[PDB]
């Protein structure tokens, strides 16, 4: 199964530019992004999905800014990116679930918000 360079939490303030939640698969073997599916879950909801087969992303309305850098996906990088509005509205535990061919794995990151 897929393996992750794990990270317990990340922290942002309103001085951040964009909020980035890291997700890194070490043992990535895919050759085309069609072989990969990326799902980001927050409090049960799928708040971001990338369907590599259909080259198609999906975010709900309150996460209108969420995205991953598909150009980086084959290096093992499924890191979620969003703006400050969406991030401060949704602080808590995020799940990064990656599917590659017949393998899958997930990892958890906590998004922390610090007031200066």
């Amino acid at each position, epitope marked *: 199964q897929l393996l992750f360079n794990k990270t317990k939490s990340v922290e942002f303030t309103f001085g951040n530019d964009t909020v980035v939640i890291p997700c890194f698969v070490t043992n990535m073997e895919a050759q085309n992004t069609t072989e990969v599916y990326v799902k980001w879950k927050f409090k049960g909801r799928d708040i971001y999905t990338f369907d590599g*087969a259909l080259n198609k992303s999906t975010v709900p309305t309150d996460f209108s800014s969420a995205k991953i850098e598909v150009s980086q996906l084959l290096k093992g990088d499924a890191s979620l990116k969003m703006d400050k509005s969406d991030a401060v509205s949704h602080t808590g535990n995020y799940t990064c679930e990656v599917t590659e061919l017949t393998r899958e794995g997930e990892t958890i990151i906590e998004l922390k918000y610090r007031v200066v």
Partner: antibody
Amino acid sequence: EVQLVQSGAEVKKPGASVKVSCKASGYKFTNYVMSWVRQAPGQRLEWMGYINPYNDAIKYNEKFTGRVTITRDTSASTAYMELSSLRSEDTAVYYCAREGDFYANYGRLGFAYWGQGTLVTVSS
Amino acid sequence: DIQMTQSPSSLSASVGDRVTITCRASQDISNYLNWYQQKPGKAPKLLLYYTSRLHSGVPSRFSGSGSGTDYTLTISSLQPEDFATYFCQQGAGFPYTFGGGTKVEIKR
């Protein structure tokens, strides 16, 4: 080239069991789910189930539970479908199938590679 | 289970004709519909996945469209090697189910 080569046609007495094999070649056997679909002569195709050769997970159609058994031999690059308690209505061509170069979608995005078919006739 | 119904059952048309066949599902399947081509005594061949995506190799005269429960396959300029039965398959929910098939024959 991807290639799915199945075992020969067989006749089985009603009540007996059959085991169709499917040898994959031209790609990494564990990288893709192997599905099984059957087609009775003159009828439409019907999904039977799949196996993930990586984690050995399987799913069956409710119609065949208790009778169907999908297995794989990773070193042999071979999936197997075994149907038991055969009825004269199990007479069909049985196919193994495989998806395109995708993540494991189990046929939601279509079966892109098919075996040539194994005709199983159930008769006394 | 999701029931698939195709129309027409069989069909005849000249070389070059535009041919259109419809697949209908007993409930929304969210564009998770696939089209197959099968010649007698042969295994099926994937033509389109996800309503409108050409499988690699399939000539461009094949095309699909639809949403919800109603989908169509269209051959723009019918060719002799298009003689076959065409099947739809819903990929929405298990168990996956197939239409009853449309036979396409050539008038010459």
